[PDB]
């Protein structure tokens with residue numbers, strides 16, 4: 001795929017307030033650069049090809 | 055309908071009654087005429103608007119839910135997701151069918167009812183001065199001019215004024 005026979009597998013970890021992340025590796029780590037801020041609310045996702053009007 | 059007035063002892067509706075749902079037609083010494091009954095018309099209309107507003111009130115608001123279409127076969131978890139959705143849809147579809155069936159039966163019966171109530175109220179005003187001809191018409195046994203007819207229509211008819219005349223015509 002795009003020249004490549006190798007792959008990256010993606011994982012995720014959520015860390016709550018007062019907890020801590022530890023990353024321990026001796027090779028093959030694709031490291032995070034930071035974190036995404038989690039929110040709760042009314043957001044969602046939908047698959048559609050419909051145009052978006054005003 | 056349950057009351058047997060509409061499509062009953064009232065043989066048919068009036069396409070020419072265009073200013074109301076229920077009303078009166080008369081023939082007297084001054085000619086013939088027609089008038090809508092406002093109270094009965096509005097009672098039926100008010101009930102129907104009541105049930106309509108109860109039905110079209112408050113759709114539910116839902117946001118993030120479960121996926122309902124899938125591009126790969128997955129087995130057990132997808133099976134369950136699809137079954138949950140199908141089950142939900144069949145239940146709501148049943149609710150919709152039943153809701154309109156019950157509401158509509160009841161709408162027919164309540165309008166039939168309003169027709170019957172107007173008929174009974176008129177009969178009661180007339181006391182011994184009229185007889186029910188059985189087709190939703192009263193034969194009034196005294197001279198009853200346009201103002202008299204209007205007194206019946208507006209609920210102020212005074213039967214005692216006409217009682218001697220009417221009884222003489224009915225029974226002798």
Ligand SMILES: *[C@@H]1O[C@H](CO)[C@@H](O)[C@H](O)[C@H]1NC(C)=O
Pocket residue numbers: 200201202204205208210
């Ligand atoms: C009822 O009709 C009579 C006769 O037309 C009229 O005199 C009277 O004003 C009416 N009453 C009402 C409450 O409108």
